[PDB]
Amino acid sequence: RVNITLACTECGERNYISKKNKRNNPDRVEFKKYCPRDKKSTLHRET
Amino acid sequence: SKAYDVSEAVALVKKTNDATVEVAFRLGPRKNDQQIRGAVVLPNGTQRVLVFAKGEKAKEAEAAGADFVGDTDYINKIQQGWFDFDVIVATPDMMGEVGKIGRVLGPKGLMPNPKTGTVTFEVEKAIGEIKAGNIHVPIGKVSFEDEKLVENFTTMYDTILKAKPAAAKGVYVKNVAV
Amino acid sequence: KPVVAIVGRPNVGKSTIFNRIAGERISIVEDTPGVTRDRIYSSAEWLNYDFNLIDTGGPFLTQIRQQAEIAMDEADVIIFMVNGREGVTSADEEVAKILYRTKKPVVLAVNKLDNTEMRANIYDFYSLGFGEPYPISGTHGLGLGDLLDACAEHFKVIQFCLIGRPNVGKSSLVNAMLGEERVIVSNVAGTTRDAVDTAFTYNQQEFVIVDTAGMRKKGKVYETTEKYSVLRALKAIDRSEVVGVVLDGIIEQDKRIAGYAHEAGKAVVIIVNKWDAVDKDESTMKEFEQNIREHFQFLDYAPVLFMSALTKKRIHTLMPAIIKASENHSLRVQTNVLNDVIMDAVAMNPTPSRLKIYYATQVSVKPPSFVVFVNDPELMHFSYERFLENRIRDAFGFEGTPIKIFARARK
RNA sequence: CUGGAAGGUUAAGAGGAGCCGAAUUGAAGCCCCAGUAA
RNA sequence: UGAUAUUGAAUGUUGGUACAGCUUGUACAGGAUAGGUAGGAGCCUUGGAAACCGGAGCGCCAGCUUCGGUGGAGGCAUCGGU
RNA sequence: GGCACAAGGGAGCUUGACUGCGAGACCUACAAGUCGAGCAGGGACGAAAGUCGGGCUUAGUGAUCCGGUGGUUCCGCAUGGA
Numbered sequence: 001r002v003n004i005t006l007a008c009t010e011c012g013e014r015n016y017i018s019k020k021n022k023r024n025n026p027d028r029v030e031f032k033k034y035c036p037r038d039k040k041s042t043l044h045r046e047t
Numbered sequence: 048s049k050a051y052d053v054s055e056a057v058a059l060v061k062k063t064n065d066a067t068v069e070v071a072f073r074l075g076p077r078k079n080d081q082q083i084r085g086a087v088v089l090p091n092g093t094q095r096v097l098v099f100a101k102g103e104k105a106k107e108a109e110a111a112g113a114d115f116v117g118d119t120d121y122i123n124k125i126q127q128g129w130f131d132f133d134v135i136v137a138t139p140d141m142m143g144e145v146g147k148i149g150r151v152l153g154p155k156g157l158m159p160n161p162k163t164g165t166v167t168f169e170v171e172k173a174i175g176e177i178k179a180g181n182i183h184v185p186i187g188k189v190s191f192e193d194e195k196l197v198e199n200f201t202t203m204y205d206t207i208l209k210a211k212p213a214a215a216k217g218v219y220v221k222n223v224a225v
Numbered sequence: 226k227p228v229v230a231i232v233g234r235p236n237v238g239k240s241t242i243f244n245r246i247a248g249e250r251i252s253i254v255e256d257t258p259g260v261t262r263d264r265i266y267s268s269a270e271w272l273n274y275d276f277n278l279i280d281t282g283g284p285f286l287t288q289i290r291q292q293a294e295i296a297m298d299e300a301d302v303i304i305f306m307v308n309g310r311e312g313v314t315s316a317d318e319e320v321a322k323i324l325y326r327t328k329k330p331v332v333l334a335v336n337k338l339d340n341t342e343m344r345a346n347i348y349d350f351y352s353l354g355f356g357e358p359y360p361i362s363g364t365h366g367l368g369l370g371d372l373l374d375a376c377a378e379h380f381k382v383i384q385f386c387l388i389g390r391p392n393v394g395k396s397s398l399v400n401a402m403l404g405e406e407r408v409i410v411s412n413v414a415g416t417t418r419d420a421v422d423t424a425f426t427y428n429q430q431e432f433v434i435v436d437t438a439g440m441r442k443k444g445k446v447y448e449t450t451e452k453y454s455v456l457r458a459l460k461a462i463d464r465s466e467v468v469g470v471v472l473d474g475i476i477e478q479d480k481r482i483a484g485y486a487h488e489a490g491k492a493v494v495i496i497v498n499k500w501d502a503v504d505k506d507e508s509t510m511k512e513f514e515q516n517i518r519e520h521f522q523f524l525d526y527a528p529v530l531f532m533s534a535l536t537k538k539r540i541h542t543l544m545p546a547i548i549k550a551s552e553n554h555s556l557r558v559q560t561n562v563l564n565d566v567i568m569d570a571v572a573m574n575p576t577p578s579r580l581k582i583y584y585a586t587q588v589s590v591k592p593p594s595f596v597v598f599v600n601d602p603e604l605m606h607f608s609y610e611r612f613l614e615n616r617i618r619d620a621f622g623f624e625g626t627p628i629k630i631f632a633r634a635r636k
Numbered sequence: 637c638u639g640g641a642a643g644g645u646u647a648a649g650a651g652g653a654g655c656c657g658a659a660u661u662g663a664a665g666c667c668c669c670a671g672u673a674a
Numbered sequence: 675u676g677a678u679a680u681u682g683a684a685u686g687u688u689g690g691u692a693c694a695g696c697u698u699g700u701a702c703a704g705g706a707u708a709g710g711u712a713g714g715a716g717c718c719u720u721g722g723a724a725a726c727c728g729g730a731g732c733g734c735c736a737g738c739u740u741c742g743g744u745g746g747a748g749g750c751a752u753c754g755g756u
Numbered sequence: 757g758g759c760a761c762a763a764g765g766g767a768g769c770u771u772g773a774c775u776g777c778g779a780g781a782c783c784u785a786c787a788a789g790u791c792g793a794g795c796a797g798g799g800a801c802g803a804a805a806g807u808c809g810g811g812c813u814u815a816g817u818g819a820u821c822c823g824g825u826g827g828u829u830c831c832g833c834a835u836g837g838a
């Protein structure tokens with residue numbers, strides 16, 4: 001398992017930091033939650 | 048061998064011909080931080096300026112003198128064709144979108160960039176004023192009189208010097224070639 | 226595996242990016258002159274993809290630039306960094322000239338944009354005629370996702386170190402070993418800046434050699450955090466188990482340099498260089514052999530080796546010497562046999578108010594280490610501890626490696 | 637330890653064809669010379 | 675243990691600076707196959723301007739840059755865009 | 757310490773596994789340190805109200821003087837900027 005940071009798409013900054021397994025999920029996942037700066041929930045992707 | 052004067056060279060570039068009198072000026076990269084590149088409206092002074100106005104700014108762009116504005120996107124008409132004419136300016140909203148299209152403006156010298164005062168909200172005032180460390184500047188014609196190029200070179204030199212670059216230390220002047 | 230390389234001009238966040246990709250070995254300062262001076266390797270991870278990374282540099286400038294060209298060709302894709310705050314400079318096109326004739330894929334990057342408002346001003350960067358620029362930031366992890374994908378699109382054991390003081394020939398030593406031009410050699414002191422990795426195979430056995438650019442006196446290090454490079458040497462020592470020491474054919478700092486290695490519980494080997502420089506005739510080696518023995522006595526297990534980099538003599542013997550030190554540093558013994566001899570030592574020296582010996586056993590095998598079960602932990606004498614040390618180092622080899630000894634109480 | 641290059645090896649390889657390895661290059665070390673015995 | 679002032683005079687050996695003058699960048703075009711700044715406001719002329727034959731630098735070892743008398747008021751044609 | 761009403765399974769995507777914020781237990785030496793009331797902003801199969809997680813405490817050494825890099829409607833020593 002490794003540590004991962006999530007990046008905002010609309011606003012464009014790191015908001016959430018977490019962990020995932022390389023083998024089970026070898027690809028980049030689309031997580032959807034709140035971006036506080038935008039005052040509105042936006043899609044997130046990891047870098 | 049002799050460095051002529053400004054009052055002699057304007058009357059003499061009459062005799063170096065309807066041609067255009069232009070000025071080279073060697074600047075004094077190390078100093079790229081305080082480089083000297085720019086544009087200013089001219090005193091003693093045909094272009095075809097096409098604009099990329101967005102929203103309400105097209106409504107004041109069609110009365111100032113511009114030839115073609117657009118249907119809010121004609122870069123697809125720019126793709127596979129597009130004999131560009133004179134000057135491309137834009138507005139600070141669609142500049143990023145036009146820019147993400149590629150170097151159809153890179154090696155052609157018309158890419159909108161707000162360092163030059165050409166990408167702004169005042170498109171009506173922008174149409175009306177445009178119509179190795181070196182700057183080129185067209186100050187005028189052969190057929191202008193002797194008192195026109197003196198103010199033209201004076202205005203351009205005061206613009207250069209008004210802009211006394213930071214790191215002013217060391218000589219700023221190297222050469223004027225009229 | 227795929228190889229990636231980054232090139233550019235002084236002050237473009239390259240070493241910085243490379244570190245942000247993985248690790249912090251790359252040295253980072255703020256000034257024009259201080260840049261990574263040579264190639265360095267590493268490993269990366271981006272999805273199933275797992276390519277590496279080659280870092281380059283911007284007095285002597287021809288060599289490093291040439292080294293960069295070496296990287297240029299043997300690479301798979303090209304990373305071309307450039308600054309965003311100050312637009313386009315002369316050096317940008319200067320390097321662009323060779324990039325144009327470089328029949329390799331190119332991915333451009335723009336740094337120094339760490340805020341949304343600064344994300345603009347990319348249209349100007351359309352001169353190269355290359356593809357789409359993708360902004361990145363060093364202080365923050367911005368815009369890296371687009372860059373990596375841009376790269377992934379075209380994308381399809383022991384270790385020993387050598388140390389010394391600056392201006393001795395340590396860089397010349399290595400390159401010659403591989404027989405390959407790998408690191409820069411100059412006649413000025415402290416030419417190398419930071420540690421460089423080098424992996425190679427010898428006799429069906431792979432090895433990893435490392436440089437540490439030499440070290441000056443500890444009061445002599447007053448520079449723009451050039452200790453920041455000195456620490457990299459320290460980390461390198463921790464990374465590998467075997468250290469070779471290189472002296473030129475004696476100064477007390479060389480003893481001080483050997484100070485860190487001995488306490489580190491890492492095998493250490495003595496090497497000399499430039500033997501051609503001095504007189505070389507009958508029985509010459511003895512003078513140095515006892516001088517180093519007389520000077521260096523807190524270490525004894527270190528074998529003495531002789532080589533001269535320039536004429537390349539006896540260099541073959543160096544490698545094997547390293548292998549022998551290895552298992553010695555990783556060796557356990559049967560506890561029965563060890564305790565079998567502990568008494569003989571005490572029989573011959575029945576003068577330890579008196580200490581008593583009951584048991585001793587090997588615990589730490591990573592570095593030869595053991596523990597003795599005695600009656601009074603205070604009653605001992607360091608000379609007696611030095612006595613039991615030699616006896617054991619004479620019963621078996623344990624040569625070329627240090628030994629740590631512990632004395633627990635009866636409990 | 638000392639020269640003088642001859643006798644080849646070139647050494648892990650650097651390279652690789654067919655199928656793990658062709659050819660082809662490749663320092664030392666082996667006197668392959670004795671003097672030397674420290 | 676290296677710099678610098680005492681420390682001065684002439685030889686040659688060179689250097690480094692600047693100042694002129696001359697010459698240099700062959701490339702995937704364009705009579706070949708050349709670095710950052712205008713599409714002309716042609717030259718008649720001249721080791722050949724067609725062919726024509728020296729000279730380096732050379733060569734990108736291709737094929738050029740001009741010093742350039744035969745043909746020569748003929749010639750490429752400012753002129754266009756592998 | 758659970759008896760399925762907390763170890764099956766379409767959708768509900770999905771680590772609100774969040775941004776604001778707070779009454780009591782502690783140890784009650786306190787600092788500190790910990791664990792769980794109560795609420796605007798849509799942010800959910802959601803429809804009746806259920807959401808700050810992997811259902812015993814067991815961690816990423818101390819998360820810090822760890823800032824040197826960065827947004828500043830805050831100051832700026834006579835007035836502008838730095």
Ligand SMILES: Nc1nc2c(ncn2[C@@H]2O[C@H](COP(=O)(O)OP(=O)(O)NP(=O)(O)O)[C@@H](O)[C@H]2O)c(=O)[nH]1
Nearest residue numbers: 235236237238239240241253254260337362363364
């Ligand atoms: N403001 C800002 N500064 C940055 C950013 N990235 C790097 N820097 C600064 O730029 C400095 C130069 O980077 P560094 O990696 O040291 O460059 P280098 O080692 O000389 N290699 P190279 O010059 O080729 O990039 C860094 O020390 C850092 O202070 C960034 O995104 N923003």
Ligand SMILES: Nc1nc2c(ncn2[C@@H]2O[C@H](COP(=O)(O)OP(=O)(O)NP(=O)(O)O)[C@@H](O)[C@H]2O)c(=O)[nH]1
Nearest residue numbers: 392393394395396397411416417438499533534535
């Ligand atoms: N005569 C002789 N010179 C040598 C020998 N080995 C190296 N040299 C020379 O001594 C100098 C030292 O070069 P270098 O390898 O950079 O030594 P270093 O500075 O200690 N290594 P680093 O650059 O990493 O600090 C070079 O001029 C090199 O040619 C040798 O065995 N004999």
